[PDB]
Amino acid sequence: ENFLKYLSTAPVLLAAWMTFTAGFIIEANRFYPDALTFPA
Amino acid sequence: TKVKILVERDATATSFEKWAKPGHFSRTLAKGPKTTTWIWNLHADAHDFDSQTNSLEDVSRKIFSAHFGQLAVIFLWLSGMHFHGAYFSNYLAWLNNPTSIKPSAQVVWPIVGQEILNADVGGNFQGVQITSGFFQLWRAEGITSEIQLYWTAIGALVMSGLMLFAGWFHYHKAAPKLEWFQNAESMLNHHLSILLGLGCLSWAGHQIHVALPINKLLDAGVAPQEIPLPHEFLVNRDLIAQLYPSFSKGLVPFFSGNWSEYSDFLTFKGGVNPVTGGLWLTDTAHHHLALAVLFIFAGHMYRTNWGIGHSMKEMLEAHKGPFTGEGHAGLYEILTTSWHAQLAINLAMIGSLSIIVAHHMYAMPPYPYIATDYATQLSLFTHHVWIGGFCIVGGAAHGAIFMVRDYNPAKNYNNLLDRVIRHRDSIISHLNWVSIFLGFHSFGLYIHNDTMRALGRSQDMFSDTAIQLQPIFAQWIQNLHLLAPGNTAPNALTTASYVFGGDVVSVGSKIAIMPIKLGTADFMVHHIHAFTIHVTALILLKGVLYARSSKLIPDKANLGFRFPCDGPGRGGTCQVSAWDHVFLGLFWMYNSLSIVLFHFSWKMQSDVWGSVTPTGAVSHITGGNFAQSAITINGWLRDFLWSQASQVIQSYGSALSAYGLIFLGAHFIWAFSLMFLFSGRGYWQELIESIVWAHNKIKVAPAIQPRALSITQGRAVGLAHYLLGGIGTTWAFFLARIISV
Amino acid sequence: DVAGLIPCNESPVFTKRLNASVVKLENRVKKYEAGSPPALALEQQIERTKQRFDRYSKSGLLCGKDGLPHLITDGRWSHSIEFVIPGLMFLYITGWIGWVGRKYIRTVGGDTNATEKEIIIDVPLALKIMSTGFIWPISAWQEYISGTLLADVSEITVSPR
Amino acid sequence: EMSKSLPFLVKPKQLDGWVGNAEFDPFSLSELLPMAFVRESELKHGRIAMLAVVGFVVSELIHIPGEAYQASNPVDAVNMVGAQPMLQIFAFCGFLESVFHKGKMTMMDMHADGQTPGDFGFDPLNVSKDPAKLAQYQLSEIKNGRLAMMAISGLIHQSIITGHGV
Amino acid sequence: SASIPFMPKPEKLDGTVPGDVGFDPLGFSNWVNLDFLREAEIKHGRICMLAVAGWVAVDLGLHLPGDVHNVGSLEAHDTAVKFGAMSQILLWTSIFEAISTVGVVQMLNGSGRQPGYFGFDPLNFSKDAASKAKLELNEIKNGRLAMLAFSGIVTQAALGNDF
Amino acid sequence: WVTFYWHWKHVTIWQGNPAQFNESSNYLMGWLRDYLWLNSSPLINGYNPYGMNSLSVWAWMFLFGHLVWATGF
Amino acid sequence: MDKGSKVRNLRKESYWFNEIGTVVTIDKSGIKYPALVRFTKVNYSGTNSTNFSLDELQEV
Numbered sequence A: 001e002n003f004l005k006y007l008s009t010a011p012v013l014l015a016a017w018m019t020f021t022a023g024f025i026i027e028a029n030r031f032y033p034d035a036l037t038f039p040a
Numbered sequence B: 001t002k003v004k005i006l007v008e009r010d011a012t013a014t015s016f017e018k019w020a021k022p023g024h025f026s027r028t029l030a031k032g033p034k035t036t037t038w039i040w041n042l043h044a045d046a047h048d049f050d051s052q053t054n055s056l057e058d059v060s061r062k063i064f065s066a067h068f069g070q071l072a073v074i075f076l077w078l079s080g081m082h083f084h085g086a087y088f089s090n091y092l093a094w095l096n097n098p099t100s101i102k103p104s105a106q107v108v109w110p111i112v113g114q115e116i117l118n119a120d121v122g123g124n125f126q127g128v129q130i131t132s133g134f135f136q137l138w139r140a141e142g143i144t145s146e147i148q149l150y151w152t153a154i155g156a157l158v159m160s161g162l163m164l165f166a167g168w169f170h171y172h173k174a175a176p177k178l179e180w181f182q183n184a185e186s187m188l189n190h191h192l193s194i195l196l197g198l199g200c201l202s203w204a205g206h207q208i209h210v211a212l213p214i215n216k217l218l219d220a221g222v223a224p225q226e227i228p229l230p231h232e233f234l235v236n237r238d239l240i241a242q243l244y245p246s247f248s249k250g251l252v253p254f255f256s257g258n259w260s261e262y263s264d265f266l267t268f269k270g271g272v273n274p275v276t277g278g279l280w281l282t283d284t285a286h287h288h289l290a291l292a293v294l295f296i297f298a299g300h301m302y303r304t305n306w307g308i309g310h311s312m313k314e315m316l317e318a319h320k321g322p323f324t325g326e327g328h329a330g331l332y333e334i335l336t337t338s339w340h341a342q343l344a345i346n347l348a349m350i351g352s353l354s355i356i357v358a359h360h361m362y363a364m365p366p367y368p369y370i371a372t373d374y375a376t377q378l379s380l381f382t383h384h385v386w387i388g389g390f391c392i393v394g395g396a397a398h399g400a401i402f403m404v405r406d407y408n409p410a411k412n413y414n415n416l417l418d419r420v421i422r423h424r425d426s427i428i429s430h431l432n433w434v435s436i437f438l439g440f441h442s443f444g445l446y447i448h449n450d451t452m453r454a455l456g457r458s459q460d461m462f463s464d465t466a467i468q469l470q471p472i473f474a475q476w477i478q479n480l481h482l483l484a485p486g487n488t489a490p491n492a493l494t495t496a497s498y499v500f501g502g503d504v505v506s507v508g509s510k511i512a513i514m515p516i517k518l519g520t521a522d523f524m525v526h527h528i529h530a531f532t533i534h535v536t537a538l539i540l541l542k543g544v545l546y547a548r549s550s551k552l553i554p555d556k557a558n559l560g561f562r563f564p565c566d567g568p569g570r571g572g573t574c575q576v577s578a579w580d581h582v583f584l585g586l587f588w589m590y591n592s593l594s595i596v597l598f599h600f601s602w603k604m605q606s607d608v609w610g611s612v613t614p615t616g617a618v619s620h621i622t623g624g625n626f627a628q629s630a631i632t633i634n635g636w637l638r639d640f641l642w643s644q645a646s647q648v649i650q651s652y653g654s655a656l657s658a659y660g661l662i663f664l665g666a667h668f669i670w671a672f673s674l675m676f677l678f679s680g681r682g683y684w685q686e687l688i689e690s691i692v693w694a695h696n697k698i699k700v701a702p703a704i705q706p707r708a709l710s711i712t713q714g715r716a717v718g719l720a721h722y723l724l725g726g727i728g729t730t731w732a733f734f735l736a737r738i739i740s741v
Numbered sequence C: 001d002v003a004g005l006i007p008c009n010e011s012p013v014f015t016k017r018l019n020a021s022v023v024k025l026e027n028r029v030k031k032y033e034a035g036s037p038p039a040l041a042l043e044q045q046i047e048r049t050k051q052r053f054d055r056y057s058k059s060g061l062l063c064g065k066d067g068l069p070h071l072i073t074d075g076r077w078s079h080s081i082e083f084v085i086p087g088l089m090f091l092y093i094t095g096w097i098g099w100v101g102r103k104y105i106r107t108v109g110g111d112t113n114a115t116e117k118e119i120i121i122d123v124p125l126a127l128k129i130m131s132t133g134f135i136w137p138i139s140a141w142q143e144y145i146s147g148t149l150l151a152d153v154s155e156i157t158v159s160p161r
Numbered sequence D: 001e002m003s004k005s006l007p008f009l010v011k012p013k014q015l016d017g018w019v020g021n022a023e024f025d026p027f028s029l030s031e032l033l034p035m036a037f038v039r040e041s042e043l044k045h046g047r048i049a050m051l052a053v054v055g056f057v058v059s060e061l062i063h064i065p066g067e068a069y070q071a072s073n074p075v076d077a078v079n080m081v082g083a084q085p086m087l088q089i090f091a092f093c094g095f096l097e098s099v100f101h102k103g104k105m106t107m108m109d110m111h112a113d114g115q116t117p118g119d120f121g122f123d124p125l126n127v128s129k130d131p132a133k134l135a136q137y138q139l140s141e142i143k144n145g146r147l148a149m150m151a152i153s154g155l156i157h158q159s160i161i162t163g164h165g166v
Numbered sequence E: 001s002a003s004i005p006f007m008p009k010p011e012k013l014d015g016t017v018p019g020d021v022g023f024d025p026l027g028f029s030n031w032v033n034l035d036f037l038r039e040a041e042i043k044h045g046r047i048c049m050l051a052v053a054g055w056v057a058v059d060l061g062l063h064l065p066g067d068v069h070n071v072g073s074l075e076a077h078d079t080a081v082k083f084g085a086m087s088q089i090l091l092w093t094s095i096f097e098a099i100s101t102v103g104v105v106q107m108l109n110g111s112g113r114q115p116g117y118f119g120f121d122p123l124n125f126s127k128d129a130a131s132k133a134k135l136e137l138n139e140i141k142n143g144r145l146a147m148l149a150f151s152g153i154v155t156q157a158a159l160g161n162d163f
Numbered sequence F: 001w002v003t004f005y006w007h008w009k010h011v012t013i014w015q016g017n018p019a020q021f022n023e024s025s026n027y028l029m030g031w032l033r034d035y036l037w038l039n040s041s042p043l044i045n046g047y048n049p050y051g052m053n054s055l056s057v058w059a060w061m062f063l064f065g066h067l068v069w070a071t072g073f
Numbered sequence G: 001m002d003k004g005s006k007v008r009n010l011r012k013e014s015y016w017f018n019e020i021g022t023v024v025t026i027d028k029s030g031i032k033y034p035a036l037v038r039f040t041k042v043n044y045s046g047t048n049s050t051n052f053s054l055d056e057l058q059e060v
């Protein structure tokens, strides 16, 4: 319980969520790079 | 047995319950957040153990285990460095051809086009060129293979794990009692005789048995593949006797006293190795052996359990003269009852030592092929200079903290501290006068030269072809050091460093090290250095002495170490605390070290670093424009900043583009810091009030009320961003100016 | 067309930029043996550059006198692909975020430990709320027309109002 | 009192009154989310997997004139140009999801009063005759749905690696 | 003290762990959970028993139909990582190990799970009559034997082909 | 900002290569290099060790303004 | 008005102006500001209560 509650603290969750967002953004740019504009 | 081991078993229970109660350590923060200020406080008082418990034993146990944690972090950092050398570096190719191959141990994933940062360093390898001199260090150790680097990283990881376990064990399982910590004599004996004595002895053994033969074979041109493994140099003595035909005699000369027989690999030639451009490995081996002997001897000075030894308490009490009342009576209690005093001394010494290291390493390149790596030399010098300045200012800050918190007048009656506090006014007034005198004269020399050069009166300036200010004393010292070999150091074949005088040591057509001539520009810049150092000392010493009281605030001590002010009364009372004195001293230290780094960079580029021809002609990087252009402010602005900033501004589209981006980012952060530095808290509080009204109008309102940063936090953030911006700007400038080569 | 811009499909400067990039990459790779990891990386970079330029040519962007694509953001539907479409996406995503956040604020706010639930997030409730953001526009409009979006004038203010 | 599917974990609770009570929840995601919504999602994923697996098998068997012929479905769907058909089907699926959920769109809105998971009426075949037969068929539906999810994942990925999924 | 008669009577030992004989010179158990140690020992033993069986099986026998299996045990790891079978076995063992990690945490918390309890008895060789304790002593002992034997086999085959 | 924009655009137009601004004004490094670093060369060279010219006064005032700006801090 | 009753603040200078606070105590022994009120939010000084006169409170 205590460990999960600690994982629920603001800094830990912010770090985890920002890492997740950076990860999926990086992957999206990896599979569809140089995306200046939308495909037709 | 007065010195004995005392511990408490199971001092603290291990559980995660506390991890879910942030701010548990402090009594005020344990009540939960009412406003956002709480958040900041939780990160500001995290390591302020003294303010969390009134017992010294608990603070001591926290400090010990936090030091264990720091050691674990450092070992993890070393493990990472070594692993990136083994798996992601061109260390082998650099080994084969050190001159041409550029060191690099970092690789970037190609994700957004950042793969351009993968430079064409060489050796069929692409990566970010490193400037940490790790390749030269590893070569000096005779690594010669990536398996050894891999195992070095594994050992570092295991050591980091051991440090973490030791911290946990010595807090939660076996926490030493306070009496255990208060053993200065035993601690000094153990840290001198073993940590520094046997450390030197073991490293000397390594050099004698591993680094020496391997590096000698490498200098002879043996390819790393054909060099036998280091363990092969420990089993068959003859295999080493070929290189140094003194092992054949073995250890019998050592015990018989005929140490002269070891002069083959224990030399005192000094100078620099012409092939690699670094110090002779035999010289370093003899050096470390002598240091090991001295440290082991010095580790027996203090009395621990057997009558013989020195009692530092009596030693201090004994030194008292007519001018100083009670002499050093009460300093032992101060240094064994307050961690802030010890931290102040240790930080000041570590910072000064780091600066000494920076000065000595460039003058006498200790590792092979580090002298001609201009990028490494500059990076190491500037890094260690910055570390030294930060440590010095931290020592000042913690001295002030000790004065505010751990200073007790009852135990400090008419001793040195009392008397210093009692003529602090005279000390500060005279330091102020000398600071003003130095500033006026030194900087007005530059202003005068600039004015005369602008008016066309070049014959009236303070230049070599004009009114001359020759550093005669420094030149005399250089001459004496030049003449030392054979006369005052008869057993030393060559001068300690070629800076003072002698030949031009060049490796692979690059000037590794050459004599540095001192002219009027050197005189002026040295006096500028002295001025800045004196002003920084003024600020920090004033903060320390007036930390408890002043003619403005007779009761400053009750206000604490760091507080914003004491109101707008008595005129104004802004930045009256010692913490604010540290805040200003950090700015002045940054300024002084910036001047030091500019002096070093320009002088080395214009007078030492360069190229040589087969005949012997010297061509420096900037053509020796330091003598006639370093004597005016406009000269520094034009020939140093504007001229040498071409690399950063033009680095776009190349592997150094990251340096240009960081140049701009550092400028941005430096300018951003001014927002906190100039503005005050009231404006931002009112703006936040308006923004909070806007949020509330939509039924969005955080339970944790937003608050503008406290005054002290505003200053701290401004200073932190100012320092980051300045340091990053110079970092990018130097690295791009010295990597386009 | 638009402001004297010629489509990048028939832009000589655009092709010159493509050629310059490719040729400089080729000059860089000429100092590595064929098949070496650096050579493969540089060849992949060349291929990625060619694909990027081809995609820009085929997309329909407008080039300038400098050969670089220019964006038209006056609402022109033929150029919505440049700004309007992504913008909407942003306003959706952020909208979602904002809405979700507001909901959490108004969900844990009715508790004695409301502050304690902001430093420590109630991850189950937090994810419950976060999964509901895909209908943020509808819920926002319903609250607006229902009077539950904005607070009444009876709220905190300052001496002069 | 002890787990069944994984006989080395404590039996998770809040899993009794449910058709697929095989007692499999190591990471305890059920404890992290409302059971009704997540089981309804299980039903939806299973039904979509069933439809997708049938649709992939049929396509690789027979086709529609002029809609592309004799190709792997992951490739044919790519071969659609202009997104003309896919947006139509997307809007149709949204229409039906809205009709079925009756406007209780999200999880919090969903399960307002009863909203039994995955019912949506639509049972013309004579059922609800008794809890026994109805629960038997529901358990069959869950098992077949999970099997369909795995089958469709496998078929689509095996088509990706190979040319034809089979 | 059992076996070693001059050692300091292993602490927090015996009364459990059918395989124990009282041999704890360093005595890690005193300062660490015994359940965790038992789980580690049992898992190492099982994995290594399978490893010995595989190494002897690869010894010029039972090779799979694929041509890549003409390769020997020493080169098997490299050929498998290149072939990618190794990555897949990693995937499946990782899945099993995570599901078992939940159980290890529960056991430590006090869930009452026995160290190696994975309820895996398809042919229920165990019976109340057979005596689970008697069945386990052999399990633990042959597991330790396999641990040591495989370490030796790999080392002395890296020296020279054992057979 | 306004004066920098006006001056750089007019300088590029006067030089006869307005393309330089159109190219380098889209990123900040362009402002730092092609406008400040590039156009200050005739200024900081008002007086050098080789000699001085009519602009020496302006270079002196340049350094003076820098000094006063710093003193404000 | 009474103990435990919610009152809207009307003091213009107050940090909790136009806010709801719960009455803690009322002094019937004369006094100019007898009604002690407590608010959820803490002001800039960290306090969350103040004395008001009954004229400076809207009852509910």
Ligand code: CLA
Binding pocket: B043, B044, B045, B046, B047, B048, B049, B343, B347, B390, B391, B392, B393, B394, B395, B397, B398, B401, B561, B562, B579, B582, B586, B720
């Ligand atoms: C041996 C080294 C050492 C040790 C053990 C301490 C220990 C302590 N110091 Mg001292 N100090 C040191 C060095 C040290 N300091 C140095 C070198 C300086 C000079 C700057 C100071 C200046 C100083 C002051 C002025 C004060 C302390 C205070 C304290 C106490 C609280 C510290 C705390 O809560 O951390 C909290 C830590 C943080 C909030 C982290 C902030 C770290 C900086 C700001 C950011 C680092 C940026 C990073 C390096 C790069 C960023 C890159 C970017 C791109 C993201 C504690 C007793 C405070 C006190 O009251 O003690 C009684 C106090 O007022 N110290």
Ligand code: CLA
Binding pocket: B432, B435, B436, B437, B438, B439, B440, B443, B444, B447, B535, B538, B539, B584, B587, B588, F067, F070, F071, F072, F073
């Ligand atoms: C470049 C701007 C600048 C300048 C010139 C100064 C100048 C000075 N600072 Mg300041 N300071 C600055 C920026 C500057 N600071 C910034 C940015 C900070 C923020 C961190 C500080 C923070 C700071 C602190 C905290 C302290 C100083 C101190 C000092 C003094 C050092 C002693 C000295 O040199 O006296 C000599 C004066 C000069 C060299 C100024 C130039 C004068 C020239 C040479 C001659 C001028 C011509 C002449 C007067 C002609 C007269 C006629 C004319 C009027 C017509 C001096 C007054 C220290 C101090 O006052 O104690 C000693 C001190 O403690 N400063």
Ligand code: CLA
Binding pocket: B691, B694, B695, B698, B700, C097, C098, C099, C100, C101, C102, C104, C121, C126, C127, C129, C130
């Ligand atoms: C979910 C929380 C939330 C919401 C709904 C809003 C909504 C708004 N803000 Mg506020 N704001 C927030 C958080 C939030 N803000 C935070 C955390 C900060 C501190 C950085 C600010 C600082 C701020 C300022 C300074 C200003 C606004 C303004 C505005 C308005 C215009 C939009 C805007 O400028 O956004 C700007 C948003 C930011 C600058 C930072 C947002 C950072 C993240 C994305 C938001 C927090 C998300 C959080 C993780 C929620 C998690 C939920 C989860 C636990 C379930 C709008 C009313 C402006 C205004 O008054 O307009 C009239 C304005 O001037 N906001």
Ligand SMILES: CC1=C(C/C=C(\C)CCC[C@H](C)CCC[C@H](C)CCCC(C)C)C(=O)c2ccccc2C1=O
Binding pocket: B675, B676, B677, B679, B680, B681, B684, B685, B707, B708, B709, B710, B711, B713, B714, B715
């Ligand atoms: C800008 C400013 C503020 C307002 C600044 C605030 C409230 C800081 C806002 C911080 C935000 C909310 C955190 C996120 C910031 C970055 C996006 C990343 C995090 C940076 C570090 C905190 C890690 C003051 O309160 C202030 C007080 C006294 C003197 C000067 C100033 C001052 O200059």
Ligand code: SF4
Binding pocket: B564, B565, B566, B567, B568, B569, B572, B573, B574, B575, B711
């Ligand atoms: S301006 Fe700020 S620091 Fe100065 S007296 Fe006023 S409150 Fe204190």
